[model samples]
Target: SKTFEVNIVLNPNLDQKQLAQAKELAIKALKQYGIGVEKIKLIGNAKTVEAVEKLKQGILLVYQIEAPADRVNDLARELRILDAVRRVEVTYAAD
Candidate 1:
């Protein structure tokens, strides 16, 4: 088993409620793989709204997974299908 990080950036159009839902869903999905909150962090800020204003809700997730390479890919595949995901980045452990 190895640790990997999955970061997801959400689209800027989502409201606070939608953002919360998105976060919940992401956490739930990750839990299916035996991942926990200690292994993941969902971060976002509304500051981006000050510039574009129309789109500013961005979500960045970092998750540590102790799974084989195959399962990691599978997880990423499933996450990509989510409508709330704007961009997803999954990478293997540094060390």
Candidate 2:
């Protein structure tokens, strides 16, 4: 299997509790399709606001999943459409 890297931007900066809740939903879906999440990490959820509007922006959480190439398309779309996600990106081990 190849590694699939997922970059997820949250609609609202996710708290520890909400992040778990959101991942629960995402993991549930992934399990149905036999995907294994290798790792998940919050990149910049906590930070100083550079501008007043920065408070409204989202933060990034990256996930690396052990996924096969064939199923990668739907995987990205499924996670991207989640209520908590503001933006999404996914790629295989190499571009």
Most accurate candidate by lDDT: 2
TM-score of each: 0.69, 0.67
Please report how far candidate 2 places residue 90 from its true position, in Å. 0.3
Q: What is the C-alpha lDDT of each candidate?
A: 0.61, 0.63
lDDT of 1: 0.61
Clashing residue pairs, backbone N/CA/C < 3 A, model 1? none
Per-candidate clashes come to 0, 0
Model 1 TM-score, 2 decimals: 0.69
Worst 10 residues of 1 by lDDT: 46-55
Over 42-67, each residue of candidate 1 has an lDDT whose tens digit, in order, gives 56562332333544544566676665
How well is each residue in 1-95 modelled by candidate 2, as lDDT tens digits? 67777766655655767876777756654544346657777667533233225434336666777767777667767776688665667766542
Compute the lDDT of residue 51 as modeled in candidate 2. Answer: 29
Off by over 4 Å in 1: 45-58
